[PDB]
């Protein structure tokens, strides 16, 4: 078993995690390049595999606590960059990829928190430190 | 931690917040200009970053209490303008952007309130007072 | 605070509200005419404002109680007209717009009411009595 | 107030209601023929009204009890017809329209009923008996 | 009233029902061939009726209990056929139609069942035994 | 009855199941090649059957426990392959198909687990060991 | 001080109290329409007041003594009506409201009485004679 | 006053009461179909009345004495039926309704009786012999 | 020590306590806005504090003695208001808040009193006179 | 009359009762499949009867005396089985059903017994030996 | 053995216990983050442990004696804070945690005391002085 | 018969029982994975058995006497672990399972003891020494 407190996204400025990090989710994708020739041993769909583009997307939720890493993401959004982002998996290790800052949003209610979602997507080739 | 009572949207007439402000949510966006060349170190999707257009959208909910700032939004809608709007983040600061008044709606039930949603979207270059 | 019992939609025949008026909701819109030139001080989306068309839509729910104003809406639907409709906001005032009768529906169950939704949309220039 | 037990859909064979009639809902529509000229007193959307086509749709739910009127709907579906259907509104009166039998479905579970939905749509000019 | 235990889908091999048959639902359709001429006594939509194609779709849910009729459906899927399927309605009778085996799926959790959905659709002319 | 603990997806490296396997679901498909000629004994839709392509999709949920089979799926994703995957059905048997690793995602919260979904789709002709 | 023997519920047939009236309890309600705007002088919850629906419920206990007023309540239950009911408060006065007969129950033991509870709820606008 | 020994539930086989009948309680219900329109003379809740479904439930307690009427209830439970049940009210009269045998339970202790509860609920239209 | 006879709720008409005041209980609340970030020095739950809404509720029991202050509460209920209410704490002092009259109920038995409960809840910002 | 000492639950190993059997209670259930069509002679709820699933639950209390039948229940719980259980009714006879061992619990105090509850529920079709 | 007079809750102003402290109860919690993988040596539920959030709640009862520490809690409630609270365990030691003042209530009867409950909950990381 | 003084819960540090152990109760559970197919010989509910997850929960009450095993549980709670716990059944034997320390609470009154409840739940696979 691995603690959900262990997997951490973190910005550059040298890497530090953001403050409100209530729920985060790295999500990989591939578009499944269908190569269905007429011949196929039972009429099954055949796929190519390595031809497909592959992606990554980070969706971080949290409560707005002011930190320099939280101010950094605003500066990354206004001065639109694609810097290095890094996401630990507990016992796998970090990812250390270039991402962008696709859509952030700050929210607040009459009774609750200052909360924020932070949605990111892949911008380059990723890595894995094991 | 930051109080959700602190983040406030406010109209011009000089800036004052609207009356029913039950839930508000500034939401930024970027359309992620995909620049996927054939070469990429693992077949990863590459992104450009700063080429993407960037936006902002404000969705304010609340209960209809008559105020001059609430009458102002009706006047902003009928006389269709794009005036300056300003949204505080608690410990970041204000935004102070030109927005429009994209869609408002007043609602009432047989037993509940006169309530209203107020949806806005970005209309120009934004700012940040820190 | 304003009572939800106060905001009232009403038909012409001279104006009278309909019988079952369980939940009603005037909803305004504008389509946000995007004018995004290449220049923009941070790559922000610029909007025009007053060029956008603007609309209104009324969605009234209620229980079927037979009234002359309820029979009027059937006559407005079959003899398809766009007469004047009027919606009070409690402390703002009336709207007094020409609408049509876009979609109505009567519903009933084995145990419940004869209920109806009544969906309307803008058909002309609106007003505001303050 | 009007009882939901009063509003009844009924088939021809002379008119009789179907057996399982748990929830029924006549639903009218019009497609809102937008006539938005450049001139309009506040930039409001103008509509034409009577040019729009108008429709009706009946969605009847119920439990499968075998009746001749329930067998009739199967015969109306296989021998595809558009016969006269009639829906009472409690204190308005009947509708008496030609409809078709667009989609029916029979359902059953390991523990529950033999249930059925019966979806109809308008096929001609409707009426109103007052 | 009719028991939901009575309505049964069944495969050929001679007809036998499948093992896990938790919830099943035959669903008929017609696409409603709109014939809306300019003339129509109130501007009502006119429909043709018998010109529309008509269909049937069976969605059977259940828990995976191994039976020869359950193995048959796998053989019907891999060796893609359109054999005769038969669905009883309690007091109507059987349907006895040619269907295909459009999409099946087996599912299991860490604590629950081996469950399966079985989705079918019409493949020919249907029948009714009364 | 069959235990949901019995149906197991498993990777190659020789086959071993993955660690967190909270909910898994093989899902087959066929696109239903509609062959609707003008003649049909009641206007019923006719289908061809064996002409349709047929597919399979595996959606595995689970909690991130580090295993070599869990590291294998990351290596299958970055070095994009279409290796053999194998899914037991309790009393049917295995499937043993070539699949790809279409989209995986790792997720974690401030209080919960390191969890992951693992979505796969068919890449070749499948099998069945009975 | 006021005698509990004085407060009396009574049916119409002209008003007479029921026979076994061991314990009776009129109970009023309001659902407290919460209008909590973001501003509030100490973060206190603000309420609207008059927007809330208001109700009444009568729970009468007693021993089954046969009377015409006791037979009346059975006739009110089977022929489901909402007639006028009247409840005296000793020195306030009567209420004289339309109620329904929501749930009655007759009970008896091997040694005790024929007893009954009689639960009623508001059905219209109430009154007060002072 | 009426003796609690007089009110008797009784099964069919011709009607005979069950043996252990320590405490019995017929209980009627109606779900109170709320029809609360926006207009109401003091904001009072309005109710419809006759639209509500109405029910009956019998809860019989007693000590297990073997009788043919006690064996009958076991046969009614295993061979699940909805036969006629009849409950006398002392000076009102019988009820004579179709009920089912919803939940029975036999209980015994190391020192006490063989006791049983017998819970029934309405299954059809009831009656009243006066 | 402080006498329970000292703490007194009182209505406006100028403030006077109600007659039967057998047991009274002001009760304050806050909904505890949970702000649990992933970081926390032992995994402890962190809370925000001042963001939570805060309330007050008064539950007064007593015997119905007719007084003008007791008639006032009936008038406050029928003419639904939110007037000022005031509750002394013996050596703290008064509260002097706006409340509503949420649910009152009058009760009487065949042998006991005319008794009443009186339940109130906060409607505005409260105070404290020290 | 029947002795509570006579009704006995008993395990298989051939059937023997457990040691501490202070209070035991077989409890049957049915979920009452509501079939309420719009028509019903007085608006009464109609029920289907035999469509409902039916269950059984055994709750045995007792003091922990070590017996092989008491050790058997621990072995039935750890090696999770659904073996045959048998419950005598004094003059009815046995039940002889397959049950599971849903929840057991051992309890002891500083002064009292080693006591245990043993809760079981139905797992198959039951019987009755008369 | 340890005296219940020894365990004491105490406020800051430097720490002093409150006056009426009739019954007090610190209560800790953890939400038990269920990590139940499909594999488990007997089908047992597996738990993670340290991932769960952990809490504390203090419920203090007492009689209202006016003290500065009792006035402090009112000031902590109106000026909503989360100050340090401290609870001795007799021979363990203090806790010294930040709590809030979630719900207090003052109560009094016609014959008894001015009594109060004081309910608190954890607001931060706690401690232990041993 | 078995003494309640014999069944003992005990912590690790090697195993020792806690000091105040006034009432303790191991409680096992299984969630009863319902596998109710449409076929069942009398419409009885069928269950699977071994698919259900199985649990254990320990609720220990006692008076706070300071011991190293009592200090251990505080250390187990703050440093959140899931160590081995062991519960003797008198003549069965020990259990020896991994549990967590889900919720403890210390309580004291103005006249009584320092008392504590200690609630635990299963965290892994259990055992049985016979």
Residue numbers in the entry:
A (entry chain D), B (entry chain D), C (entry chain D), D (entry chain D), E (entry chain D), F (entry chain D), ...: 3 to 15, 20 to 136
The authors write:
Gene transfer agents (GTAs) are DNA-containing phage-like particles produced by some species of bacteria and archaea. Here, we use cryo-electron microscopy (cryo-EM) to determine the structures of RcGTA before and after DNA ejection, and to visualize the interactions of RcGTA with R. capsulatus cells. Particles of RcGTA have heads with a diameter of 38-nm and 49-nm long tails.
The RcGTA tail contains five discs of tail tube proteins (major tail proteins) (Rcc01691, g9), which are organized as a six-entry helix with a twist of 24.4° and pitch of 38.3 Å. The N-terminus, short loop, and loop β2-β3 of the tail tube protein enable its binding to tail terminator proteins. The part of the tail channel of RcGTA formed by the tail tube and distal tail proteins is filled by a trimer of tape measure proteins (Rcc01694, g11).
